[PDB]
Structure 1
Amino acid sequence: EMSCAEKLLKVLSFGLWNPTYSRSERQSFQELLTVLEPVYPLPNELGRVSARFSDGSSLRISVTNSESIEAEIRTPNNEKITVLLESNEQNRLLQSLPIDRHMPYIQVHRALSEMDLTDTTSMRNLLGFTSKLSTTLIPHNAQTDPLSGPTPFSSIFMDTCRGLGNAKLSLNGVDIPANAQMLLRDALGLKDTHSSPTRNVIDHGISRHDAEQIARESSGSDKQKAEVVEFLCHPEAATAICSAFYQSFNVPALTLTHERISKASEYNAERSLDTPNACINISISQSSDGNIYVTSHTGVLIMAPEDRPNEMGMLTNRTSYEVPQGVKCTIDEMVRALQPRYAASETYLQN
């Protein structure tokens, strides 16, 4: 009887990591929780989150800068209920949303199942989970600022070539799989790793036909698919996609942690564990006002501080930013328009 949007909302209030949940229930939650996508926040919001499920029910949670939480359920029969949520220590509500907080310490989560980091699929899945939990914001100075220096953004097109077909990517909540990402790769004019996008896409966006092809190959609802086509036909949709892959977004966070990341790299290379170096999980949404928000995740293996030695987990970097209107897909143009905000969290397998 009870919708998805509602099920999930019960969970988040009782608490994701609540000990009274059977393991089989935890998996069924992580399934509901991954529908959550970050989206353009309004001016007083610390972050806004949205979920549209297959049973036709949606959910919109928003957290204000004063860290006040408000949810909105939309039943499959279009009823608009609005709940006030309180986050505390038994639920850790605030920690189980994709939101950037101003904490005095980098946030630490515990994986909810045995995502034992052996291979690629293990890692991706864990990043799949961590992408939906909170992160602590990290400031940069002139030297660690991804957008400063002599050549900011110089690598996005290379980064975009390597990333597409190897990322987990969602537009307006629609999962764009590898095949589709690979069509999108060709759709931007980035067929080979040494190119820039075509003068035609930079100016007019992806062609309608290309967009429809990509959206057909994608998993997701029919209505949502349509929003994806309309999204892709914008000069700014090319800007959003390409920039989300910028490698140096990760510099503020590694500055604080790389020695531990390298330690994990070595630990694993000695056991012949074929574990990727990094995983990317992007999430881009256009509001029904035209607002383009990018939330881009990089997961990377990391060793716990030398207090719980030989334990290994994942470091997640979230980069959030709006792509304003008329910001065309150009390096020179990205450097002066886009204003990223970097944040991180450490997740360890409760195991």
Structure 2
Amino acid sequence: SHMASSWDEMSCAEKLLKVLSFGLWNPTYSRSERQSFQELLTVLEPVYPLPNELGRVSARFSDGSSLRISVTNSESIEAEIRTPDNEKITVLLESNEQNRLLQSLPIDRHMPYIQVHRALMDLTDTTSMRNLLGFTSKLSTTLIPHNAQTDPLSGPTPFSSIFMDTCRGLGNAKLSLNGVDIPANAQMLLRDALGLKDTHSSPSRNVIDHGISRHDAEQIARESSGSDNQKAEVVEFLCHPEAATAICSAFYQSFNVPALTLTHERISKASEYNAETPNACINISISQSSDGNIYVTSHTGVLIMAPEDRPNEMGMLTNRTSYEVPQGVKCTIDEMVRALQPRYAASETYL
């Protein structure tokens, strides 16, 4: 191997760390490698962060190996590597301008300018746009300040559109629960299980009080892709009221408001450049920790023109919204408004 003399003996977790140490965008990789490495990267999932952490990431690979990565507010990065035989090592990761390691993690950074990435294609094709968001959802973003005017939870009717948004979004989204992919057909089952039969529907009182029925959760998990163990985690997650809250809230259309204030002109230019446009794509990760903490990371991707410095370059604005869903918060508009405290971040990715 050109990566390491012991490459073929290394676990998925160990391989991903090596890839990131050389850099995801390393110029020596082949086309086939870039594909394989993306397949490792997509396993990364943002999860509930500890008190003084910018972010925390979990990856559970098909070979039984895993990573837990934490990033401190000073951007110190530490990883715990668990081998399939479940031995544990803790290592410090090193991010530098050569590898851009931190940029290849789903972490919200504090920066004066919006993070810019390069893709590894494009782009007016719905499938390719979804694939690009699949990638950018694993990369770093820049936190965006908001005020009373631009706060998605302000105004007279915050979250008022949430069930319509959920109804329209399920079936078209990329959705992961505890790292388990929920495919389109399973999402449609989930939509129905929430009670969202049409765009003007809202959850049943049973779902509000108890979450998805065990029967429905089992069918959804059955249609999802994972081991018998992975499906079990999904069923257990779904059968709680807070699971309904997390899933529905993740679709809120207005999470993009802070980012739009910075970018709407260039988004408009992209829409016009195409008239010479597939619309927003959605990619959501929800995880519940072993301590029971539910964390939502919801992404939307839209086409955007590069600044005038780079003429005729169209890329993707990725908006990341991150928040805990506290225990006891049921799936009603008033509950979401009362309890959810998201933060908003963005990146721009060009081909």
Q: TM-score, normalised by structure 1?
A: 0.97
Give the drift of 1:23.
Answer: 2.3
Separation in structure 1 between the aligned mates of residue 275 and residue 241 of structure 2, nearest angstrom: 42
Separation in structure 1 between the aligned mates of residue 228 and residue 20 of structure 2, nearest angstrom: 28
> Which secondary structure does the structure 2 equivalent of 1:255 belong to?
helix
Separation in structure 1 between the aligned mates of residue 228 and residue 86 of structure 2, nearest angstrom: 18
Separation in structure 1 between the aligned mates of residue 113 and residue 227 of structure 2, nearest angstrom: 39
Deviation digits for residues 276-295 of structure 1, max 9, x if unmatched?
A: 21000000000011100000
Separation in structure 1 between the aligned mates of residue 166 and residue 203 of structure 2, nearest angstrom: 11
Give the drift of 1:118.
Answer: 3.1
Give the drift of 1:66.
Answer: 1.7
Q: TM-score, normalised by structure 2?
A: 0.97
Deviation digits for residues 307-338 of structure 1, max 9, x if unmatched?
A: 11111000000000000000000101101100
Give the drift of 1:249.
Answer: 0.1
Separation in structure 2 between the aligned mates of residue 66 and residue 284 of structure 1, nearest angstrom: 26
Report if the CA contact (8 A) 1:174-1:221 is conserved. Answer: no
Separation in structure 2 between the aligned mates of residue 269 and residue 163 of structure 1, nearest angstrom: 25
Report if the CA contact (8 A) 1:54-1:221 is conserved. Answer: no
Give the drift of 1:222.
Answer: 2.0
Matched, 1:2 2:4: no
Report if the CA contact (8 A) 1:137-1:342 is conserved. Answer: yes
Give the drift of 1:58.
Answer: 0.8
Give the drift of 1:44.
Answer: 1.4
Map 1:62-211 → 2, pairs under 5 A: 62-112=70-120, 115-211=121-217
Separation in structure 2 between the aligned mates of residue 24 and residue 46 of structure 1, nearest angstrom: 33
Separation in structure 2 between the aligned mates of residue 203 and residue 167 of structure 1, nearest angstrom: 26
Separation in structure 1 between the aligned mates of residue 75 and residue 231 of structure 2, nearest angstrom: 33
Report if the CA contact (8 A) 2:45-2:57 is conserved. Answer: yes
Separation in structure 1 between the aligned mates of residue 104 and residue 318 of structure 2, nearest angstrom: 14
Map 1:177-326 → 2, pairs under 5 A: 177-270=183-276, 275-326=277-328
Give the drift of 1:123.
Answer: 0.1
> Which secondary structure does the structure 1 equivalent of 2:262 belong to?
coil
Give the drift of 1:173.
Answer: 0.4
Give the drift of 1:268.
Answer: 1.2
Deviation digits for residues 39-66 of structure 1, max 9, x if unmatched?
A: 0011111100010111111111110112
Separation in structure 2 between the aligned mates of residue 120 and residue 295 of structure 1, nearest angstrom: 22
Give the drift of 1:225.
Answer: 1.2
Moved over 3 A (4+): none
Separation in structure 2 between the aligned mates of residue 173 and residue 232 of structure 1, nearest angstrom: 14
Separation in structure 2 between the aligned mates of residue 133 and residue 146 of structure 1, nearest angstrom: 23
Separation in structure 1 between the aligned mates of residue 338 and residue 177 of structure 2, nearest angstrom: 24
> Which secondary structure does the structure 2 equivalent of 1:10 belong to?
helix
Report if the CA contact (8 A) 1:111-1:347 is conserved. Answer: yes
Give the drift of 1:27.
Answer: 1.2
> Which secondary structure does the structure 1 equivalent of 2:275 belong to?
helix
Give the drift of 1:8.
Answer: 0.3
Deviation digits for residues 77-132 of structure 1, max 9, x if unmatched?
A: 111011111111111111000000001110000001xx121310010000000000
Count of residue correspondences:
343
Separation in structure 2 between the aligned mates of residue 222 and residue 37 of structure 1, nearest angstrom: 20
Give the drift of 1:21.
Answer: 1.5
Tell me the C-alpha RMSD between the 2 structures.
0.8
Report if the CA contact (8 A) 1:265-1:301 is conserved. Answer: yes
Give the drift of 1:197.
Answer: 0.4
Identity among equivalent positions (%) equals: 99
> Which secondary structure does the structure 2 equivalent of 1:219 belong to?
coil
Report if the CA contact (8 A) 1:297-1:316 is conserved. Answer: yes
Give the drift of 1:217.
Answer: 0.3
Give the drift of 1:67.
Answer: 1.0
Report if the CA contact (8 A) 2:298-2:322 is conserved. Answer: yes
Separation in structure 2 between the aligned mates of residue 313 and residue 323 of structure 1, nearest angstrom: 32
| Residue 3 (structure 2) aligns with | none
Give the drift of 1:178.
Answer: 0.5
Report if the CA contact (8 A) 2:124-2:278 is conserved. Answer: no
